[PDB]
Symmetry: D3
Subunit: 249 residues, 6 copies
């Protein structure tokens, strides 16, 4: 798929396994990983030999959120900021529109973008000790990357607002209770792969159209709020509140 180092795509028949691949840095999102995720979904859509994906992270985390270095660049580099905003748009719309089922295997913390990738998936398996969180607000940023943007399709709006506003950690058990996750698994990668291979035996036209039927609701909610969210996040990158916090850490 012409991915970079930080995104390993492996082929097993009509399955694709996607592994976020910065395990030493807990899959924190740098420019390279970000651009990779922007491009990947349309590519899956356009490859007829792919019929399903699994997304997971290498090592202990799914993704711990933004890379501090990447973040500090974003607050001083306008060209980089404009590109990240385009790509950000393409991840959300890439996954919203993606042809094939995507099964998430949350092996570890999924924070920020990680947490948004999980809300944009079709079925989610999560490890007992893993959690979801979005700490955008606590760090000085509008949560635009897809988490809070998509959470009201999954949970109550009250709950969405509280977790977006305060960076609440959502445990594996709680996420399943809420419908932010489908199953707690001991081995979420394995359980994910078996659910995707199960889906691969089903009639293709039926599988692909039914995902599109449901994702229309997702796409409606995205077109309503995404341009404003991205625009506002862009303004937050240049706030003293953000610049200060992202310098300390």
């Amino acid at each position: 798929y012409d991915m970079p180092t930080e995104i390993d795509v492996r082929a097993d028949g009509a399955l694709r396994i996607i592994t976020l691949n910065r395990p030493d840095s807990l899959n924190s999102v740098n420019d390279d990983l970000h651009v990779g995720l922007a491009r990947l979904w349309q590519r899956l859509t356009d490859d007829p030999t792919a019929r399903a994906a699994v997304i997971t992270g290498a090592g202990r985390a799914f993704s711990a959120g933004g890379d501090f270095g990447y973040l500090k660049e974003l607050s001083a580099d306008a060209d980089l900021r404009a590109k990240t905003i385009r790509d950000g748009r393409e991840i959300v719309l890439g996954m919203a529109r993606c042809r094939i089922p995507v099964v998430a295997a949350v092996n570890g913390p999924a924070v920020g973008l990680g947490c948004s990738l999980v809300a944009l998936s079709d079925i989610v398996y999560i490890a007992e000790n893993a959690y979801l969180a979005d700490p955008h607000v606590q760090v000085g940023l509008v949560a635009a990357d897809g988490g809070p943007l998509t959470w009201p399709l999954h949970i109550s709006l009250l709950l969405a607002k509280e977790y977006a506003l305060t960076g609440t950690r959502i445990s594996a058990q709680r996420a399943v209770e809420l419908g932010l996750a489908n199953h707690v698994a001991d081995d979420p990668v394995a359980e994910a792969i078996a659910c995707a291979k199960k889906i691969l035996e089903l009639p293709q036209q039926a599988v692909e159209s039914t995902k599109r039927v449901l994702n229309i609701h997702l796409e409606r909610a995205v077109l309503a709020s995404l341009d404003y969210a991205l625009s506002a996040e862009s303004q937050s990158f240049v706030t003293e509140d953000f610049r200060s916090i992202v310098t300390k850490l």
Copy 2:
């Protein structure tokens, strides 16, 4: 309301009891049951002597889904196909816009369309051992009849995706917890009747307009996706995948 035998309608004052009536086939859907459902909602809306309904199934099930013979005919006959699509649309739009409250008494399995009727009701009572399921995808069909379509109004979209794609049976308890049903009942038809009867004592104009206020959301969601959904299921009927799954399922010697 000029229903065919497979939809029994009983009046009890201002109440209508709607019983799906092919009990020996687990009330599975044939053309007559389908057509009747398509016409029924508008005729209730226009009968000012009706102000509430209960819908249930005769015998052990609420509805086991499509009659395999009906489904096989649908893969072969383009005219019948186009008809079923029109009538399917009318069931969904018909319920969405139905003037009177509709209380489901799910007496056993509500599968495929049955499960969609339950999603389009206002209040659901469900028996302890009944379940909800939509096995459209397992069988080669796009789930358009109104279940998965409207499930996201009741439940997490992630959970709607999973159940639409895997055809999981949803127990009465799991359903009540999820908000796909309202109460578990020893006698769901008795409890539905009582529920509807309380609603009949209440001021009509408040009851009717308040349903309308809440169903606008349902209508907004259906308008976004029903046409596409129906067109896709129209194509599903003609696929080799579906022909081969249904030609086995309909082969009964």
Copy 3:
């Protein structure tokens, strides 16, 4: 500073505003003044930059018991007042949906009718152990237009919204939190809501206010689809024999 009447006390504590529904003797029931004040408050908070967060609660044992029977009787008899209350009813919903600052509810006691709609329109909700939510509009001959059943489908299953709205069932604190109609049960909801708002106040402003906005776009889209219909239908129920007859019994206080 916000030209509120007696029936809405508003208190400043730094950048926090504490809003108290203030008719304790009537269990904070809605009369015209309380309705007008609620209509005008939210824009005035948005425009006060010294304000950055708000807590809303009730004086005495109740959050709000809903409609003042005297007022409701007057509404079934006065077409001018009716048209005004519809206008102000749109402003409460629109004002809260569009309000710049996070609003945390402290449901100290029953939140009924307009009461529970103010709750459904808040951002974070703390509820007392013995408090409950209810909307008895339909039992009383009125369409539930206030913002309750109107907004409920964004928190809970539509099936459940249809039941609770058609029957007026009471939703206990434990049940509300189980359902997503509230965030937390509290021994002391006012203290807990105040601490929650004060914790938010420490967060970067532009991030908090923008994030409320992103989330409330979904709420505004839902309100815009049904609000004018809902309020127009409620207008009509004030003039029904059903309501006129029910509200005459209720407004009969010797």
Copy 4:
């Protein structure tokens, strides 16, 4: 034919249906029976596979002069007839918006009030040289709810729709065509709309029917946004003194 009343004549001519509003002594003003007919018709057309296209027109000199004053005074005095008429008005609008077959309008004379709404809901419109469109709801103390102004923004500037709905301006045949409220000025709108429909009849059915649905999605979204409120507000009109007073004189 379709169990219509006398007030609505439906004629078949192969796969075409010709719908003629039928109270020419009253300029096809709308009474209850015509109104109920209009609500039932479209779903029945939709459900008749031997029907593939419609033309709609008026008997005699008018297309339709709008609201029969007898009906309207009756509507102002009886809550149950109000509730039924709102219910049916809803069905006319959704009926035509959801209708399977192409509907071609032949506007033979004035199309006023509801009649002008029938035109806006049609797919192609031929209008006689001397004919006009108007919606007089407001000047009569009624909210303009039953499809006209409600639908006009899909045809014309919102500014123009607002002015015409508030002032009840007459829109001439030429002027209708200049705005896109009508497709062609016709000497014989009945005949020209009949040939239009026969032309569409020869085209591939599935292409024709699906294309209508594609464009009417935009119509349906605009209606769904506003119809419930407009009908509710018009129900309130029937009951005001301003209306009771104006309709008494008329």
Copy 5:
């Protein structure tokens, strides 16, 4: 007046209100005081039961020649004023959209930028023979977010709304009526608008006000869809070096 600043005169003539932008020396260009008054007024019109129709026009030669340059210059430097002018910008748009009474514009001279937006947001528009409409936002480094181009798609072709919001080209009185941006060309548009509003005053209140809401539902939907994005972007525009450059030149 209605607590308007001097920059907005409101005169009462029975149930009628005449709203007059009142900085003729600067051709009614938009400063901060005018902007605030425009934000506050609409809700106050809606809440005054003794008002039932309104006309809006400009003192002197122009209806309004868009932003005061001095004002736009502050907006490039003061962040608090920026956030405030964005808040009130929403209120002009949402307040006009939701306003109870019909509003009839008398475009007596050029309506530029915000002026052109107030016209788009009106119910019925009368325009002088030598007047015109324009939005030069883009030529000046600003996103056109005030409610002009935001709203133009409900009146005209999207292709045309794009041409004019991009090129900033002027729309003559005659061309505006032809497109659907104006209702009537007038010799004396103040007088034609006043007469139009008076006719409307004679009509049954409930029918007028409801019919306005029915139609404005479409404007409200179009605004909700793009306003928050639009104002956020125009906000980013104010801090751009393109705008700082352009505006510093124009105010010196």
Copy 6:
């Protein structure tokens, strides 16, 4: 931009000239031109050095629509059909979301997909004796390319309905009278290039943000009906009506 031969892209500073390139065939649409078109718009969005585009056709026509051999192929080939549908969607979604202003130089007939691309552009110049037309229906296909689908944003729904159903040729003068085009031109290509050039001088963030504000209204329309529309054009590739008409052509 890795574009096929059938789509020429030329650079002139920040300008991109897009010339549809099958002149001997009146730039009629085959699979490769179709794939090129689907892939183009995101690549333009992502090339920061492109800031405006002009689209036109080589030779005497803008585009005469579907390639007959291509359409016959589509009637008989399941996979080719599903692919053309995916790409058709990207053409529409790519144009609607394209960052940069696109100016159309309609140099001759723009028929079918031709007038759909015109409909999706932001400013249009049309030559004196050119016309817009969509004959999808008369050949047996639901008019889903984006033409009729976009028209109600430009013109009365009544006229859209008529032009779509009857395949009416819309003259250059009528197109401008309705606002299906902006100007009649002696040399549409020069006037377009000059207009695009004028735009390139304007402040970029104002230009690009303003396009987005406006195209949100386009994107709302497209999202409401595109999937139904593309699914119905798929069903019509498979009708006897279409097969007969295409085969005898």
